[PDB]
Structure formats: structure tokens, C-alpha cells
Design a protein around this ligand. Structure first.
Ligand SMILES: Nc1ncnc2c1ncn2[C@@H]1O[C@H](CSCC[C@H](N)C(=O)O)[C@@H](O)[C@H]1O
Ligand code: NA
Lengths: 265, 265
């Protein structure tokens, strides 16, 4: 009679909380999805071994179209868990799944876990200063989307930071690197020419947040565009004007050039 | 000879990640602060019991003025952990403490935990639609803070949601309720009269996120300003322009007036 939305956290199988683990262990059925994101620091096998339960993976369609025919029926006479990378309900369409549960007479509870939305605090950038967030999508065919560029513009204009999620093809396991995101943004700049993203723009790259050894690099596009940040997933941030304390952290921790202490403050 | 920043999570001791628990267990010394937030469902004893160590609790002054004199010296010869509610680097100034660590030749690692910043996802409001954040601070003497009012205005003009962290005076055991935040906001409106926060403004209250039954309520200020949302901590959110599914969730899950379903696109 109960459905548990449980977050898996950032990087590996140990990123789930103690509460999430113990609750999952007591569930009769455990489902998971890896289409909104993947756990690059672990495998399904390692997660299953840790939880001690067989885990049935669900595709995007399984969830978006048939959540009520696959997960909810079991939740009527059993304790069921639905695992997702990060913190539950962060992915835009997941909150609606709770309405589906209610509609079916099923109780649902949320067990939180670390999300990149909060984990980016490791970049030293004040989290109250982040503005609207966006996702950089690959152009294709006659389709060349650029809304994420306008997001950066509206945020930076008000001195706010822009968190940028990079395109991902979970099924094909293809990730968009920060390098690719930068090249794309430079391309969008040439078309819109709004003075939003150029070789002189300061950016921050966060990779493998949650791991014990994340990659945190900050610098100008002209110097980072071809730099190797390691294996995905990569997160890109376009800071607004910096707090001197933010800049100092970026210099001392993320290896940013001293130049930002005078140029971007 | 290392220093761990380890988040404890939202509500109780079980909100710590498995990674944080296992690392915290093997540390030689364990320090912690409980003034940046409130973990309503646990006690120091329960935390110590879970980690199996003696925890030395530090005050804001101990940290902000003497972190390098109390914590760092021990990190040079041992493995030290510094625990904090939620995520250690979110809406705190703890990030700067990593600079101090580095300058003392001490390596530091950050272990994230669920934060209120991402937990807002449980309100049904799209996480990427949040704009600049702010803190409703208690007036002191003749000093009446009001900047947070302007943040709401700026975000609202952009159709973005506003997350409002609520004040806390831990040494006086004072935790601002959403009710007090609303009262203070109406007073600021009377002063500025920008039509930003009135009896008719739709707001959302999230109380004790991290618990199994958090209080999630949405509605007009006039109706919620005196409602009892239970014990602290609370956060207040003034949504911007709503998507239909967001309104649907607020109505079905947060008990908002059915009339907000009719969004004025
Ligand atoms: N579980 C919870 N429920 C509701 N509000 C919470 C909360 N935890 C923190 N807050 C809010 O945030 C304020 C502390 S700000 C510090 C936040 C912390 N580092 C984190 O990552 O969550 C509180 O005064 C309160 O307004
Ligand atoms: Na945000």
C-alpha cells in the first residue's frame, strides 16, 4: 500500500542515504530508472548488491506512459520503491507521478538524496546567486534550439549564476562534454551576437560531483575549451559577477587564473 | 591527516549518505555545528550513537573565528570530520573554510547530503524554474532588512519561483516560521507598495522536509498567514508563473485552492 520515491545520490552506490537504504531493503519490489541520468561511479550490479534486492529497470516510456500499470498495481498490496539518480522529484516530470499514485489510492513518501542542484555548491559559488537553470541540447536536422543561451543572458544581466545541464543519451550512453557545450555556445553567440558567451567569458566546470575526487575547474573559455575534464558527467556553469570570496575560492580550489580577482569581481 | 566536510541531511541522523556514515565512522576526531540549520527529528546523542564517536559541537564564533585553531591543527596528524545539517556548502559560508584548510596545508573532501535547496522539488514546482534565492531575516533594533522583497519582485517579473530561506537564531533557539515570514513581508509591502506581496499572493510552505510526513501547503497569504504548519524548520516559496502540471500538483498534493488550476497564461 506504499510507494517510496528514493534518491540514489550523485556518483556511486554509497550516495544513497542511510534512510533510503534501510527503506529500500524492506520493500517487496524495487524499480529504478536511469534515463534522466546515470550513476557513472557505479553499476546496476553494485547497487543491487548493496540494497540486497533485485532491481527492475524501467525505461522512459515505462515511467511516463505506464507508471500506473507497472509500479502502482504492486504498491496496492506491497511496499514498493522507485529509485532515481540524485534527489527524487528533481526531474521535471517526476512530481506528477505522485498525483498518479494518489489517484490510484496509493500512499507515497519521498526519501531525499544529494542533487547536483545543491552539490554545485562545491564550486564555491553562492547558491542564492543561481538563477533560472537550463539544459544545453544538441542541434539536429533543421532544429537549432538556443533558449539556454537566453537563460544565461537574463541571469548574468542580473548578476546571477547559470547552472547548465548537458545533453545526454542515456540509452546510447552518449554524454555531451563541457568542451562540446562551450563550442556550441560559441556557435550560438556568432548567430545571436548578444555578447553573452565568448572566448573571454569565465566558466566553471564540475565533473563527477559526489565522487571522492571531483574535477572542479574555473577559467576563461579560450583556455578551457580544449582542456580535458575527464569522464562524464560534466556540468557547466556561467557565473555572474563574482563575490570576492567566490573568486578566491575559484582561484584557490578550482585553479582559476588570478586575473578573475580583478576582472570578474 | 585529512579533513572531511560531511553533510548530515534534512531531518534526522539517517539523512546522512552511506558514504558519509562509513567515512565519519573511521575518523579520529569529529566536530560539528548546528547553527546553520535545524534537524528537527534527531538529537546529538542519536548522531553520536550512529557514528559511534564523541562529537564536539562548535558555535558560530568557534567556526568563523577559530576554525583554524580548533579543527585544522588536528587535521594535520589525524583524519577529522566536520558535520553540518543538510549539505555543508549550501546557504552557509563554510566553503571559505576550505581555503583556510588549504592555506594550513590540510587536504579537504566534501561529502554531500540532501539539501533543502533541492528538496523543494517535493512542492511540485519545477526546480529549474527557481530564480535568485533570498533569506527573510528577523529585524533587530531599528534595522529592518528588506532586500529579500526585491528578489521576489525580480524573479516574479521573470515568471521565476523564489525560494526563501528563513532566519535562525540557534543560540536563542529561535526558528522563523513561514507565518512570521509572511507577516514581515506584508509589512515591507506596506512600505514599498510594489504589489509584490499581498493577501492575494499565492505562496507555498514546506516544513520539516526530510521527515516522512513533511507539511506541504500552498495557497493565498490571507488564508495561510495564520495556519499552523507544525514545528520548524520552514521555508517559504513565492511561485512565479505556473505550469499547468505545477498547479495540478499544488492542488492535489498541497491542498491549494482548485482555482489556481486556471492559470492566466
Ligand atoms: N528540512 C527542512 N525543512 C524546511 N526548511 C529547511 C529545512 N532544512 C533547512 N531549511 C531551511 O533553510 C534554513 C537553513 S539554511 C542552511 C541550509 C543547509 N546547508 C541545507 O543544505 O539545507 C532554515 O532556516 C530553513 O528555512
Ligand atoms: Na536553482
Amino acid at each position: 500500500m506504499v510507494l517510496y520515491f528514493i534518491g540514489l545520490g550523485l556518483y556511486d552506490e554509497r550516495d544513497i542515504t542511510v534512510k533510503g537504504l534501510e527503506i529500500a531493503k524492506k520493500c517487496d519490489y524495487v524499480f529504478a530508472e536511469f534515463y534522466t541520468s546515470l550513476m557513472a561511479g557505479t553499476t546496476l550490479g553494485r547497487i543491487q548488491k548493496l540494497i540486497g534486492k533485485e532491481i527492475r529497470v524501467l525505461s522512459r516510456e515505462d515511467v511516463e506512459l505506464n507508471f500506473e500499470n507497472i509500479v502502482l498495481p504492486l504498491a496496492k498490496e506491497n511496499d514498493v520503491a522507485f529509485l532515481t539518480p540524485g534527489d527524487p522529484l528533481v526531474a521535471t516530470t517526476h512530481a506528477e507521478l505522485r498525483i498518479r499514485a494518489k489517484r490510484a489510492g496509493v500512499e507515497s513518501y519521498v526519501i531525499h538524496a544529494p542533487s547536483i542542484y545543491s552539490a554545485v555548491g562545491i564550486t564555491g559559488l553562492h547558491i542564492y546567486k543561481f538563477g533560472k537553470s537550463a539544459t544545453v541540447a544538441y542541434p539536429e536536422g533543421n532544429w537549432f534550439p538556443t533558449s539556454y543561451y537566453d537563460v544565461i543572458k537574463e541571469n548574468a544581466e542580473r548578476g546571477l549564476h547559470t547552472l547548465l545541464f548537458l545533453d545526454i543519451k542515456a540509452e546510447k550512453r552518449m554524454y555531451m562534454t563541457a568542451n562540446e557545450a562551450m563550442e556550441l555556445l560559441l556557435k550560438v553567440e556568432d548567430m545571436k551576437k548578444g555578447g553573452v558567451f565568448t572566448d573571454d567569458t569565465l566558466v566553471v566546470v564540475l565533473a563527477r560531483a559526489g565522487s571522492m575526487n571531483p574535477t572542479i575547474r574555473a577559467g576563461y573559455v579560450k583556455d578551457l575549451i580544449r582542456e580535458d575534464f575527464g569522464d562524464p558527467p560534466h556540468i557547466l556553469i556561467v557565473p555572474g559577477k563574482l563575490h570576492i570570496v567566490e573568486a578566491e575560492y575559484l582561484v584557490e580550489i578550482a585553479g582559476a587564473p588570478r586575473e578573475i580577482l580583478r576582472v570578474n569581481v
